[PDB]
Design a protein around this nucleic acid. Structure first.
Ligand SMILES: [Zn+2]
Ligand SMILES: [Zn+2]
Ligand SMILES: [Zn+2]
Ligand SMILES: [Zn+2]
Ligand SMILES: [Zn+2]
Lengths: 154, 379, 303, 379, 303
DNA sequence: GGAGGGGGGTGCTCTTAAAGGGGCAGGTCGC
DNA sequence: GCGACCTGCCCCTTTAAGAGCACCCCCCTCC
C-alpha cells in the first residue's frame, strides 16, 4: 500500500520544504500554513500556548510524572522513548559522533557543540536568533532555540 | 588546457552535440557494475599460493604489497624494491584535457597510497573509439595526451611509451612504476587500536559527474529538479572535476612526516569496500569504523532521490581519483589536517577525520546513521 | 678503525660458500623470495642479498658460523662479527639495521638465544678477560646515537645501565618517567655553570628510613662536553622532545615503542605503547656484553 | 585444462554456440584500422621535447629505448636501467587457456626485443565483456588467468598484481618490467651495411585466425572453399595457435651470443610496419630490404583472394605475438638459425633469413616480387 | 706501486663539491638525465651516478680537476686518477668501463686531447722521470687482459709496442695477419720444443737488388710462463680464435672493431670492419704514457 | 468490489536548552 | 610558611523537551 515515491513542494512563500510523496503535501499545508489556532495548557501555571492538537498530548506528559521507559541495564526510568534510547548508549559504550578535525568522539550533538567552541567556527556561521544573537549555522536550530529559549507564549 | 575556464567544442570547430562522455555507457554502478565479481577477479589476478614457502621459516615480507594494490617486488641487486601499479578510467568528463589529467592522477594515486612521493617512469594506454569521427579523433587525442603529460610533469616524472588500441569505448590508463629503497615506502599493516582515519578528498564525485549527464536529458532531470537546481549541479561538476585532478604527493609526504600506519586509495568499489579490503591486511586484530562521510555540496540529497542507483550513505558509491584513507594516531591526525589545510609549500586542501580503529576481526563498517559533513563548494 | 668490515665480509663469504655447497649437493628445489624465478643461493656478496634472504642467512650464522681454524665463535666475537657486517652494509649504500628493523626480528631473537648464557671467562691468567666489543665500537656502527628511534632508545638504555647501575631487566622495568627528575643544580660559585644531570632514586633494601646521604641513594648522569653527540643529557632531552606529551608526567613506563614509519622532520618518533619484556631483555642482554658496561658494573658491585 | 589439446565448450556446461571471439569485432586490417594515425598518436605520446636537452652535452642513449618500443629509463641507484613493455590484444583464439598464454607471450615480445632474457614482475589487465552472461564468466575468465600465469611461470616470473575493468570486448593485457644492468640489454641502433635479417616465427597468423572464424558462417566461406580446403584451415589454425604461444626467450638468449646489432617484434603492424620503425632508429645510414616472407602454410593463397582485408604479400598484415626480427652479420646468422633449430635442451624451432641490409636512407621496403616460403606445418 | 681507489674517489668528491657549488651559484635550470625530474647534481659518491652524468662529469674533470691544492695535475697523473676511478667502479658493483665502452666515447676523446701534446717533465739530471702509471697498475685494473674485446685489443697493441717496438700509429697500420707468422722455433732445451713466437717485419731497410741483411731482423715475443694470463702468445691465439674467419689471411688490417654485443660464450667477438685511424691514435696515446713502455722505447733510441 | 481521498493519532530522527557533577581556582582560619 | 576547609565559577556531559516527516489505522467514498 506504499504509494510510489515521487517528490513535491509547497509553493507557500518562505516555505521551501519538500515532501517524499504527493500525499503529504496537503497534510503539511494544513498543519503548517492553514491550521492556525491557539491552545492553552490545562495546567494552571504552565501557560504555554500551542497551536496543534497533537502538541498538547505530548505537553501533558511534561507536567505529569508518569514515567514508563525502563532501561534494560540500570533499570532507570525516563519520560520518553528516545530519551531512553539515547541513555542506552552509556551502558553499550558507543560514541558515534566524532569531530572531524581532532577526532574527539562523544554521544550527542550537545557535546559536539561544546567542542566546536575550541575549533573556532562561529565566524563561518551565518544564522543568528534575533533576540539574543545566538549565532547559529542552520535554520531548524533557530526554531529549536526559539522554542527552548525565547519562548513565544501568553 | 588548464588555464581555460571550460571546453567549448566550437572553439575547436567540432559539432556542438559532441560530448566526450557520449562514448562511454555510464551506469550508476559505473565501471564496477558488479563489485563482488570484479573483486574476485582482481583477487584471482593477484592470487599466488607458492609465495608462502613455509613462511620462509620466518616473517618474510609479502610480495603482493597491500595484497590488493601496489605490489612490492624485491629485486636481485641493490636490495631495492619494485613498486608499480595500473588503473584504467573511462571518460566521465566533457573536458579531454582535464580527463587525461584525471586519468594520470588516478594511475599515480596507488603509489601515493604507500608514501611514494616520486615516480621513476610511467607508461600510457590510449583507447580510440570506433564510433568516433576521424575528424574528431584528431582534435581530442592531442588534448588527452597533453593532459596526461602535464599531470605526469606535475608529479615529477615523464610519460615515455605506451600502447594505442581501438576499443568501442575510449580507454585511458597507465602504469606508474618506481624502484625505491625500503626506507621510501610504507607497508600498510601497522594499524593499532585508538587510531583515526583521515580522508584527503571529499566523496560523491561519481554522483556529481553522472548528474551532469542528466542536465541535458529532460526525462532524468525532472526526477531531481526539486532536490538540486542546475547552478549548484554545475558547481558540483566543476569541483568534482577539479578535485579528481589533484595529486596526493603532499598527502604521501605528510604521511611519512606524521607516522601514518596504513593508507589506501578510494578508487572504485566504495569507501567501505576499500576499508574492508584494507582491514584484511592488518597483522593486528583491528576493525575500522567510519563515523563521518564528507560529500560535495548538494549530493546526498540526489543520492536519496535517485534510489539505489548511487548509494552514497552506505559507502558503496564507486569513486574515481579518490583521496587516500590514512590511519594515524589521534594527535598526528589533529596536526595532519591542519598542515595539509595550510601548507606553506603549495595550495590549500582540506582533510577530514572520518572514523576510528576499534578492535575487531579485520572488518570495517559504517554506523547506522552516519553524518554528512557538507563540503562547501570552495567558498 | 677499531671496527673492521672486511672481517665480517670474509666470515659471510665463507659461510655462504659452505651453505651453497650444502644446497647444491642436496639438489632439492627451492626458490628465492625475489620476484624473478631464481634458485635460492646465498649471494657470496652481502650487498646484493635481498631483505628476506639476509634474515634467513644471518640467523643460521649464529648456529653455523665457523672460524678459519674451525672453532665455533664465542658469543662476544660473534656479536662483534655481526657489528662488522652491519658496518659493511652501511658502507655500501644499504640502509637496513640488522638489529632494529622489524624485518630482522627473528635474527635478534636467535642472537638473544645465543647471548643469554654468557658469563665472564677467567681462563686467561688475567683475572678479567676483556671483551672484544667496546663503547666506541658501537658508536662507530651507529648503534648508539640520535640516528633513528630504535638506536636512540638503545642509547638511553645504555646510559642508564652504565650510570644508574641498572643491570637486571626488572630494574629497568621499574624505571618510570616521573621518577627520573632533572634539576639545574647550578653552582653560584661557578658563574654561568649551567650544570644539568638526571637523578634517580635507588631501590636499596635497608631497614633504616630517611635520606642518609643524598649522593649515596641517588645516581646522576654527568654532561659530557667532549662530544655533545655522546652526552647522555643531550640524548635524554632529545628523547622527550620527540615523544608525545601524553606520556610525559606518567609514572608507569619510560621506554616507548618506536613508530614503524618516521621522517627526519617528524615531530614524534615514539608511540605511547611501552616495549614488551622480550624486546627489553633482548636490548639489555646485548648492552650487557660491551666491555665498558661490563667493567662499570664490575666496579659497582664489588664496592 | 592445460594438458587438454583443444577446447570443448559443452564439457564446461556451456552451449556449443559459445565462441570466445564473438566478443570482438574481428576486422581484416586488425585491431586498429589506421596505422599512420595510430602510429602518429603513439609517437605523440612518446614525444617529449625536454627529453633531448642537447644530449646533456654528452653521449646519452635514448630514454625511449628502441624509440618505438620497450623504453629504457635510467635509474638513480647503481647505474641501473628500467626496461618495461606493454601490449593489449583481444581474443583471437577460441581456446580460453591458450588465449591467456598468447596474451602473456605478446606482452614479452617487446621485452625480448631489447635483449632482456629475464623479467622481474608482470601485471595484467582483464576486461570482462558486459555482454558476457554471468555463468559463462565463472568458467571462462579463470582459464585466461590460468594460462596467463602459466606463461609467466614459464617465462621466469610471477604475475603479482593486475586490474579488472568492464569493457564491451574482452581486453587482455599486461606490463612486463625488468631492472637490468647496462650489460644485459641490446639497444637496436648498431645496424651496419652488410648484415642480414632473421625472423624467428612464420608470418601471417591473422590470416589463419580470420579464416577459421569465417569457417562457420557460409556467407563468406563459400568463396574461400575453391582456393583452400576446409581441413587446411584447421591445421593452419593449430599451427598459428601453437606458434603464438611459444615465447621468444630462447631467441633473446642467443642475440647476446651472436652479436645482434638490432632486433624488434613483429606485433600488430606487420613485417613491413615494424621494419620501417626498426630502420628509423639506426644511427648509421642503412636501409632494409625484405627478399622473403615465410608465410604460414597455404595461408598465402587465401591472402590473395581478399588482398584488401589481409594484404600479406605487401607486408602490412597485422600479427599477434610474432617472432623477433634481428639484424645479424651473415657469418653469425648462419649459426643463429642452426643453433635455434636444434637446441641442446630441446624444443627447437626454425628461423629464416628473410632479407639483407644495405646502405640507404633509414627506410625499409619489400621488393616488388618477394618469394613466399610455405612453412610446412608441424604434425 | 698499486692502485688506491679511495684517492680516486677523493678526487671525484672534491670536483663534485666544487661543481655542485657552481651549479647552485649559477641558479640555472638543468635536469638530470634520469627518469625522475631531479635537478642535475653530481653525486658526491661515484656509484649512484648515471652513465650520462658519469660521462659528462669525467669530461669536465680533465679541465676542471685542479686536484693539487691550487695546482692542476700533469697529463700523466690524470691517467692514474681515472684508472683509480675505474678500479673503484669495478670494486663497488658498477659495470662501466670508462675507457672502451661505447657510451663513454666522448670522454676518451678529451683525454686524448689533453695527452697528445705530451711535454716531458725534465730535470737538470735528465728526463729519467718514470711516469706514475705502470704495467702492474693497468693489469690490476681490467684494462689489459682477455676480459672484454676492447681490453684484448688494447693488450695486443700494448704487447706490439712493447716488443715489436711500434712507436707511431703509421707503423701500427702497416701490420696485418699475414705479415705476422707463428714460428715453432727449436728451444735451447731439446726435450721441450713447445714454445713458439710471433715475428713482424722490422728494420727491413732497403730490399734493392736483393740487399742482404741478417736473416733475423725482426723482434720476437717469447713465452712468459710465470702467468698464463700475461703470455704474449696465448693472447694472440685467443684473439685469432675470436676474430671472424674471413678476416684471417688478409693483408689489409690487423686490429678489428669489437662487436657492441658480446656474451661470455660468444664464439666471435670482433667484426671485419677494421679499427679507425683515430681509434688507433687514441689507444696508442693511452698505451704510450705507461712508464714501462717509455723504458722499452727509451732503450731502443739508446741502442 | 474497489483504489483513492479525508481525518485522526504516533514513532523516530534531529535539534536545542537546562540541570548537574567534577574539577580548578579564590579567601579564611589553624598550625 | 604551609596546609585544611568553604565556597565560587567554568567545563563538559546527560536529561528534558519541541519540530517535523513518514507512517499506520480507520473510515468514507462515488465510479
Ligand atoms: Zn508549505
Ligand atoms: Zn503545560
Ligand atoms: Zn540505563
Ligand atoms: Zn575538534
Ligand atoms: Zn537567543
Amino acid at each position: 500500500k506504499k504509494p510510489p515515491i515521487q517528490y513535491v513542494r509547497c509553493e507557500m512563500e518562505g516555505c521551501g520544504t519538500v515532501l517524499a510523496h504527493p500525499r503529504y503535501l496537503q497534510h503539511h499545508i494544513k498543519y503548517q500554513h492553514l491550521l492556525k489556532k491557539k491552545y492553552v495548557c490545562p495546567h494552571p501555571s504552565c501557560g504555554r500556548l500551542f497551536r496543534l492538537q497533537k502538541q498538547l498530548l505530548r505537553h501533558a506528559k511534561h507536567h505529569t510524572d508518569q514515567r514508563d521507559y525502563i532501561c534494560e541495564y540500570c533499570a532507570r526510568a525516563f519520560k520518553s522513548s528516545h530519551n531512553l534510547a539515547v541513555h542506552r548508549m552509556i551502558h553499550t559504550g558507543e560514541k558515534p559522533l566524532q569531530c572531524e578535525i581532532c577526532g574527539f568522539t562523544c554521544r550527542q550533538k550537545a557535546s559536539l557543540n561544546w567542542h566546536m567552541k575550541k575549533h573556532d567556527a562561529d565566524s563561518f556561521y551565518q544564522f543568528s536568533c534575533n533576540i539574543c544573537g545566538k549565532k547559529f549555522e542552520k535554520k531548524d536550530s533557530v526554531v529549536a532555540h526559539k522554542a527552548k529559549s525565547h519562548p513565544e507564549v501568553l | 588546457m588548464s588555464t581555460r575556464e571550460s571546453f567549448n567544442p566550437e572553439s575547436y570547430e567540432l559539432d556542438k552535440s559532441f560530448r566526450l562522455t557520449r562514448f562511454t555507457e555510464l551506469k550508476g554502478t559505473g565501471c564496477k557494475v558488479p563489485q563482488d565479481v570484479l573483486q574476485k577477479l582482481l583477487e584471482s589476478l593477484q592470487e599466488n599460493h607458492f609465495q608462502e614457502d613455509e613462511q620462509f621459516l620466518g616473517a618474510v615480507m609479502p610480495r603482493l604489497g597491500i595484497g590488493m594494490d601496489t605490489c612490492v617486488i624485491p629485486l636481485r641487486h641493490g636490495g631495492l624494491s619494485l613498486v608499480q601499479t595500473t588503473d584504467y578510467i573511462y571518460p566521465i568528463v566533457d573536458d579531454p584535457y582535464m580527463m587525461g589529467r584525471i586519468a594520470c592522477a588516478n594511475v599515480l594515486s596507488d603509489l601515493y597510497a604507500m608514501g611514494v612521493t616520486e615516480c621513476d617512469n610511467m607508461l600510457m594506454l590510449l583507447g580510440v573509439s570506433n564510433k568516433m569521427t576521424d575528424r574528431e579523433r584528431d582534435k581530442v587525442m592531442p588534448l588527452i595526451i597533453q593532459g596526461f603529460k602535464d599531470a605526469a610533469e606535475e608529479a615529477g616524472t615523464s610519460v615515455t611509451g605506451g600502447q594505442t588500441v581501438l576499443n568501442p569505448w575510449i580507454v585511458l590508463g597507465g602504469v606508474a612504476t618506481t624502484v625505491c629503497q625500503p626506507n621510501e615506502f610504507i607497508m600498510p599493516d601497522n594499524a593499532v587500536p585508538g587510531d583515526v582515519l583521515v580522508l584527503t578528498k571529499p566523496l560523491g564525485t561519481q554522483v556529481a559527474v553522472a548528474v551532469h549527464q542528466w542536465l541535458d536529458i529532460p526525462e532524468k532531470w525532472n526526477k531531481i529538479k526539486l532536490v538540486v537546481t542546475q547552478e549548484d549541479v554545475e558547481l558540483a561538476y566543476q569541483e568534482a572535476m577539479m578535485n579528481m585532478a589533484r595529486l596526493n604527493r603532499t598527502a604521501a609526504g605528510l604521511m611519512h612526516t606524521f607516522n601514518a600506519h596504513a593508507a589506501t586509495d578510494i578508487t572504485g568499489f566504495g569507501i567501505l569496500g576499500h576499508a574492508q579490503n584494507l582491514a584484511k591486511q592488518q597483522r593486528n586484530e583491528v576493525s575500522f569504523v567510519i563515523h563521518n562521510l564528507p560529500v560535495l555540496a548538494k549530493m546526498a540529497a540526489v543520492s536519496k532521490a535517485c534510489g539505489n542507483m548511487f548509494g552514497l550513505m552506505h559507502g558503496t558509491c564507486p569513486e574515481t581519483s579518490g583521496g587516500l584513507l590514512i590511519c594515524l594516531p589521534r594527535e598526528q591526525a589533529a596536526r595532519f589536517c591542519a598542515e595539509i589545510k595550510s601548507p606553506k609549500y603549495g595550495e590549500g586542501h582540506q582533510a577530514w577525520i572520518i572514523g576510528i580503529v576499534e578492535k575487531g576481526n579485520r572488518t570495517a563498517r559504517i554506523i547506522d546513521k552516519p553524518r554528512i559533513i557538507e563540503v562547501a563548494p570552495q567558498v | 678503525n677499531s671496527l673492521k668490515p672486511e672481517e665480517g665480509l670474509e666470515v659471510w663469504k665463507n659461510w655462504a660458500q659452505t651453505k651453497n655447497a650444502e644446497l647444491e649437493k642436496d639438489a632439492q628445489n627451492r626458490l628465492a623470495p625475489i620476484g624473478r624465478r631464481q634458485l635460492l643461493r646465498f649471494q657470496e656478496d652481502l650487498i646484493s642479498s635481498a631483505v628476506a634472504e639476509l634474515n634467513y642467512g644471518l640467523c643460521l650464522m649464529t648456529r653455523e658460523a665457523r672460524n678459519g681454524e674451525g672453532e665455533p665463535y664465542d658469543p662476544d666475537v660473534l656479536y662483534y662479527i655481526f657489528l662488522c657486517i652491519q658496518k659493511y652494509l652501511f658502507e655500501n649504500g644499504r640502509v637496513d639495521d640488522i638489529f632494529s628493523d622489524l624485518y630482522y626480528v627473528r635474527f635478534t631473537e636467535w642472537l638473544h638465544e645465543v647471548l643469554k648464557d654468557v658469563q665472564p671467562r677467567v681462563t686467561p691468567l688475567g683475572y678479567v678477560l676483556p671483551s672484544h666489543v667496546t663503547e666506541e665500537m658501537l658508536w662507530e656502527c651507529k648503534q648508539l646515537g640520535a640516528h633513528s628511534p630504535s638506536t636512540l632508545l638503545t642509547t638511553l638504555m645504555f646510559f642508564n645501565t652504565k650510570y644508574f647501575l641498572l643491570k637486571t631487566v626488572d630494574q629497568h622495568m621499574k624505571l618510570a618517567f616521573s621518577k627520573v627528575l632533572r634539576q639545574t643544580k647550578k653552582n653560584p660559585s661557578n658563574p654561568k655553570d649551567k650544570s644539568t644531570s638526571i637523578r634517580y632514586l635507588k631501590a636499596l633494601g635497608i631497614h633504616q628510613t630517611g635520606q642518609k646521604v643524598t649522593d649515596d641513594m641517588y645516581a646522576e648522569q654527568t654532561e659530557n662536553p667532549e662530544n655533545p653527540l655522546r652526552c647522555p643529557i643531550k640524548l635524554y632531552d632529545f628523547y622527550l622532545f620527540k615523544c608525545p606529551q601524553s606520556v610525559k608526567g606518567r609514572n608507569d613506563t619510560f621506554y616507548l615503542t618506536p613508530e614503524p614509519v618516521v621522517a627526519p622532520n617528524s615531530p614524534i618518533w615514539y608511540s605511547v605503547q611501552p616495549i614488551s619484556r622480550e624486546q627489553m631483555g633482548q636490548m639489555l642482554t646485548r648492552i650487557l656484553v660491551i666491555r665498558e658496561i661490563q667493567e662499570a658494573i664490575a666496579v659497582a658491585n664489588a664496592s
